Design a protein around this ligand. Structure first.
Ligand code: PMR
Ligand code: SF4
Ligand SMILES: [Cu+2]
Lengths: 424, 400, 265, 255
């Protein structure tokens, strides 16, 4: 009923689509109305993924509102198998077919396709895309990932990276570099580059690594029991989080905590006399829960920013969010509308607000320095340049991206100061 | 005609994106689920960040398992929004796929809201769901919603039934008054002040090709349709102006004098953009239904050989005027599933591959120079002065 | 479903709680993964399993704006003996509305957080004393409806009540009445004969009322931690129960006997 | 849970003697609480619904009043016919509906002795009428927790009816002292009501209760206690300061 203008999160089937588009060769066929293929635009433009996302909406119309929708789905699955030959295939429904129940899993079993089929139950009215992605990942792990022999080398699986994710593609590369640096080999990244063969091999690792808890906590928790696999908690955004993560995977694997920090310039580039106006600036962090928490641990501990606000939109992650908010002395804004956060920063007026694209836009509307750290973004925020957000190079990226608004502000402030004085 | 397949077109709500630009005193409350909310959020893009009149009230689980509660709550939220937005004078409830399936009485809801709101806010309802509509058709439905309400005028008036930008509609009006009398009344009223007097003798000038049902709704009032090829090039524009002129009565001399400057204005521009289009294969996929007009223009003026002009919704009584200038060579096939025309594109490799945005990037990676028709509705290229700009837009001869 | 969704129904505070917990430890001994759901509003069902009172689902659920998403496993579900997951549902504190709304919410919670997927044994320790929409709210998901009763004709009348209720619910479901279990009652001659008139299967039990002193021997259930002589016979009885349920037995079907036909002496 | 056979009779039979004969409509669908004052279990209890799906003869003109030894002339009730319905059909719509179906206008005094298993968490009109008798409790950890729930109810039913209350008898199955401390914590009363030779001698209880079988209170004198509780003295006082305790404090005993 609530009047929504900018939903931070899409519907959950978008999340399932993100997981499917991320990995290779698993066709997430959908029972969706004609027109719901709009989601393909996100992956084809903002992520600029070349090939069409491996998803086949049934696209039913006023002609199709009865058992004809079931026949549409039947066709969609058998077609998708032959035409778009997968090794694994998803089923599910959007809002419309969620209301017009069609027994998606029953239909998929009715085809009885030789490739595994992952039945997806996606409540599309009370949950959101982060759920959708996590639930889809969990279902495909329980359908394809079975316990098996540990790799003789100590190995880990990165879980969490997901197509159309904030710098996920770069972050996998950075964390892979770091893990290999310690000595840990990455067994299979899922679900951003994995393949159903790789999901089958998931169990072979010694311990999963949670890069993005939003899309990976369910998978890691299930892996803890089914595959007897511990998973690291500290997402390594920023220098301090990187050190903790290094120590954590070191303990988990058994290898020394040596990690090469010769690319760490942020501790030096922020301790410099140049970065002294940055001390005690007010910041309003908003967006993804893990991103916000780690960004706060950076802002208040490695940059000198004073956190004056904090907020989130992952209700799923409200508990750690609130815990951290107490940690910094603030109160977490676990909301899902731009109105609340807008009023919050207007009351607070922090110097550097940062977060979702909305934070940037209503920063501009309020003329406040603006940065981007969280998930909801457009094509510009998806860069072609190597810009991870975790690891040491992630720390440097955070530094530059955060103080760029500040440098712009200082330079424009000067330029207005200069060439301008009382006329007489 | 999707062969039970993936029809890539959007649900009609994406038309609201530019409709809200046209009628600047009109709010659009969409009752779609989070899927439709995400669609508006995305397809609008930067619209969201400047207080757009895009209420996407999401119907949550509480709105499920109940019908009267749902539309009562809708009444409540509407009242709240006019409390936050007193400037609005026409509220546009729109039917969504979730609204259709739950059988929400959008008409009755709009009726009760109008009743308790009065003439100060003339809330209207229409349908823009993907279960019924397809992209542009939403604009058709939205204007058809106001069609019965518009004042009945039996006097001979002209209706500018189209949402062209000011730098387009104003030019059209200026030209029409330059040769004809021009009792032009733009149906997509800029404000409620300019309420057009639709009527029996108020023959309506159709200017946006995708408008199909519009025809029916206006003709119910008696408003006749001019069989004028659609104003989209040296042929469509000239024929449209000519037919509109003789429909109201204009001498050939006056027409020539009025259109002489535009004629030379656009001939040079179209030629200067056509050499990037000189003698190549085209392929229109069914995104938005402008393709027949685009083929009528581009194939004959810029020498773009017409392979297949796909169309999601073909029309006979409206498309006929520009259909006459259409060559028989292009395949008039309707909007199939993406696989069909995609395989056709792969087989008969076209130089320019106009399609939906979803296929634009893949076929671009698949060795097909692509132009997305999505740009067309926003970019003001629907009259004489912008005929060359349209050709330049279609050109896109990007080299590496 | 994907597990043996058992339903421990029948009367209040007489067996059902202790029977459910000790049966859970029995299935733990069998090795199959066990789930005990303390739907009973006493919040006491799992006490012996964990040795401590468990914060109910309703408590944590109200600790957030009734949002299941914020909650996670290991926050509302707590482990017990032999690594048995066990949850509790806190019956409403006279909040009118629905008396089984909390147990329905617990079912929703477990299914949502995938607690109700991997586990093999799910014994819904639901209050069986009363007959109200809420007490049979999880009976839908149930598959074998175990009823526990005492020799006392009040307990037997309650047993008949349970049959009537579960037959009404199974008029729309394939849940089967697994068997009438006596609960530390002594002679079952009456119980066996009552089962005979109902044609119901009189599942065997262990008669002594003091295998446990009380509180399941200071929260240490028979299987959990107990080495008494009668404990051994009872343990054999409960392993017999566990294997009987796990294999599956005859589809016994008691006809609901009217109260007068029940021995009214 | 308790049979209430040892109570429904041996509280207010002396009241039925004193005032107008009680109708004693105590909720006991096992036909095991009120019958002891009557000559037998009398399972009939006008369970037949002579009016088509309605209470027989609409308002039944006192056509049941099963006679008893000490001026009983009462009726009994209790039945789970409907079975199904969340708050609208079974415990939501008790088959008794309002007690006004029975002629309270003509049988003013009524004794309610519901079992007390916090039934009908929906419908909340029954189990709270009348001013003479209330839910009788007993002495057992589950029993004390349940009657604590009964307290929480009547406190939540403070605006309901006339909150007659006046306390409740803790039927002392034995000399358990937990009830005393528990009631001290709740500022309630426990006194004494020993059930003995009642459930096991029911062949004699079926017609006459303990205070009228062979004068079995001759060695089990407890009728003067009730003359304090019921009859002339009535124990009006205050409603013995009821105070329901949440779960942790109802665990004041090891339980
Ligand atoms: C629903 C998904 C989607 C997304 C991602 C947006 C925003 C956006 N859509 Mg396109 N757009 C979608 C659909 C549509 N777009 C709309 C708007 C819009 C325009 C005017 C433009 C465009 C484009 C894009 C793009 C990429 C370029 C941009 O951000 O502007 C986004 C994210 C972009 C283009 O096609 O390529 C240059 C462009 O100039 N769209 C409209 C027309 C009413 C619809 C239906
Ligand atoms: S039937 Fe049960 S759950 Fe429903 S209102 Fe009554 S007590 Fe509550
Ligand atoms: Cu800049």
């Amino acid at each position: 009923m609530k009047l929504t203008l900018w939903t931070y999160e899409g519907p959950p089937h978008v999340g399932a689509m993100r997981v499917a588009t991320g990995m290779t060769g698993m066709h997430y066929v959908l029972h969706a109305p004609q027109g719901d293929t709009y989601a393909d635009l996100l992956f084809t433009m903002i992520e600029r993924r070349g090939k069409r996302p491996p998803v086949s909406y049934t696209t039913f119309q006023a002609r199709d509102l009865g058992s004809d929708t079931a026949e549409l789905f039947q066709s969609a699955c058998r077609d998708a198998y032959e035409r778009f030959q997968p090794q694994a295939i998803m089923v599910g429904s959007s809002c419309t077919a969620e209301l017009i129940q069609d027994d998606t899993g029953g239909l998929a079993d009715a085809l009885s396709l030789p490739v595994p089929v992952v039945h997806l139950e996606l409540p599309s009215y009370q949950r959101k895309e982060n759920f959708g992605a996590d639930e889809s990942f969990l279902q495909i792990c329980r359908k394809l990932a079975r316990p098996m022999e540990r790799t003789e080398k100590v190995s880990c699986n990165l879980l969490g990276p997901t197509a159309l994710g904030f710098r996920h593609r770069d972050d996998i590369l950075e964390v892979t570099r770091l893990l290999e640096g310690m000595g840990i080999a990455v067994n299979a990244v899922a679900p951003m580059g994995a393949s159903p063969a790789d999901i089958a091999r998931l169990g072979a690792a010694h311990f999963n690594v949670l890069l993005y808890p939003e899309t990976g906590e369910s998978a890691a928790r299930w892996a803890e029991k089914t595959l007897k696999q511990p998973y690291t908690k500290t997402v390594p955004i920023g220098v301090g989080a990187t050190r903790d993560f290094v120590a954590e995977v070191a303990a988990l694997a058994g290898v020394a905590p040596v990690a090469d920090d010769s690319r760490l310039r942020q501790p030096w580039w922020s301790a410099s006399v140049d970065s002294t106006y940055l001390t005690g600036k007010r910041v309003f962090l908003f967006g993804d829960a893990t991103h916000v928490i780690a960004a706060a641990r950076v802002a208040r501990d490695e940059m000198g920013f004073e956190v004056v606000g904090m907020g989130c939109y992952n209700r799923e992650f409200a508990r750690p969010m609130r815990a951290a908010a107490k940690g910094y002395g603030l109160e977490a804004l676990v909301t899902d509308d731009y109105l609340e956060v807008e009023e919050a920063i207007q009351a607070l007026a922090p110097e550097l607000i940062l977060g979702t694209q909305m934070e940037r836009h209503i920063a501009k509307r309020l003329g406040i320095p603006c940065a981007v750290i969280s998930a909801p973004v457009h094509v510009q925020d998806f860069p072609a340049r190597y810009s991870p957000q975790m690891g040491f190079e992630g720390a440097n990226v955070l530094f530059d991206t955060w103080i760029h608004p500040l440098t712009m502000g200082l330079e424009e402030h000067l330029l207005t100061m200069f060439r301008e004085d009382f006329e007489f | 005609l999707k062969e039970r397949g993936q029809r890539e077109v959007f649900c009609g709500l994406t038309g609201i994106i530019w409709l809200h630009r046209k009628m600047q005193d009109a709010f659009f409350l969409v009752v779609g689920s989070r899927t439709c909310a995400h669609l508006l959020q995305s397809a609008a893009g930067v619209m969201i960040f400047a207080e757009p009149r895009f209420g996407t009230a999401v119907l949550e689980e509480k709105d499920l398992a109940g019908l009267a509660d749902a539309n009562a709550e809708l009444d409540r939220e509407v009242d709240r929004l006019l409390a936050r937005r007193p400037d609005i004078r026409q509220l546009f409830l729109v039917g969504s796929c979730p609204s259709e399936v739950i059988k929400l009485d959008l008409h009755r809801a709009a009726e009760r809201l109008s009743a308790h709101h009065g003439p100060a806010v003339r809330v209207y309802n229409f349908s823009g769901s993907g279960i019924e509509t397809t992209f542009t058709q939403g604009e058709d439905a939205c204007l058809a919603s106001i069609v019965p309400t518009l004042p009945a005028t039996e006097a001979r008036e002209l209706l500018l039934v189209g949402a062209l930008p000011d730098v387009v509609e104003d030019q059209a009006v200026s030209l029409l008054t330059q040769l004809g009398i021009g009792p032009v009344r733009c149906l997509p009223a800029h404000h409620a002040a300019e309420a057009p007097g639709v009527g029996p003798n108020t023959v309506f000038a159709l200017v946006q090709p995708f408008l199909g049902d519009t025809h029916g709704a206006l003709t119910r009032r008696g408003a006749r349709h001019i069989a004028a090829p659609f104003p989209f090039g040296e042929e469509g524009t000239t024929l449209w102006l000519k037919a509109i002129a003789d429909e109201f009565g204009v001498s050939a001399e006056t027409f020539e004098a009025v259109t002489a400057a535009p004629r030379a204005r656009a001939r040079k521009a179209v030629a200067a953009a056509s050499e990037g289009l000189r003698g190549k294969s085209v392929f229109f996929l069914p995104d938005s239904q402008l393709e027949p007009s685009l083929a009528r223009f581009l194939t004959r003026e810029c020498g773009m050989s017409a392979v297949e002009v796909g169309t999601p919704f073909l029309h006979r009584g409206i498309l006929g005027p520009d259909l006459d200038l259409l060559a028989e060579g292009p395949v008039l096939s309707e909007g199939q599933d993406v696989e069909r025309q995609l395989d056709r594109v792969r087989a008969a490799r076209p130089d320019l591959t106009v399609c939906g945005l979803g296929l634009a990037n893949p076929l671009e990676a698949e060795g097909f120079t692509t132009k997305w028709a999505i740009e067309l509705v926003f970019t003001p290229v629907h009259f004489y002065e912008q005929a060359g700009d349209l050709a330049g837009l279609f050109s896109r001869p990007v080299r590496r | 479903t994907g597990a043996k969704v058992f339903a421990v129904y029948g009367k209040g505070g007489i067996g059902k709680s202790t029977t459910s917990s000790n049966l859970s430890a029995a299935f733990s001994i069998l090795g199959k993964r066990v789930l005990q759901i303390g739907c009973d509003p006493k919040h006491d069902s799992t006490f012996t399993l964990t040795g401590s009172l468990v914060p109910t689902v309703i408590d944590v659920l109200k600790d957030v704006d009734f949002h299941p998403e914020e909650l996670r496993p290991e926050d509302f579900v707590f482990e017990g003996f032999n690594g048995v997951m066990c949850v509790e549902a806190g019956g409403p504190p006279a909040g009118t509305g629905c008396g089984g709304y909390v147990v329905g919410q617990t079912v929703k919670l477990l299914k949502q957080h995938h607690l109700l997927d991997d586990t093999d044994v799910v014994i819904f320790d639901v209050l069986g004393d009363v007959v109200c929409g809420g007490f049979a709210a999880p009976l839908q998901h149930a598959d074998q409806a175990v009823v526990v009763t005492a020799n006392d004709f009040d307990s037997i009348y309650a047993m008949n009540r349970i049959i009537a209720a579960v037959q009404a619910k199974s008029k729309n479901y394939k849940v089967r009445l697994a068997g009438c279990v006596a609960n530390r009652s002594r002679a079952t001659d009456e119980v066996d004969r009552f089962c005979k008139e109902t044609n119901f299967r009189r599942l065997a039990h262990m008669p002594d009322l003091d295998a446990i002193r009380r509180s399941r021997l200071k929260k240490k259930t028979l299987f959990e931690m107990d080495e008494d002589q009668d404990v051994l016979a009872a343990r054999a009885e409960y392993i017999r129960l566990a294997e009987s349920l796990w294999r599956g037995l005859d589809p016994i079907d008691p006809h609901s006997l009217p109260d007068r036909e029940i021995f009214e002496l």
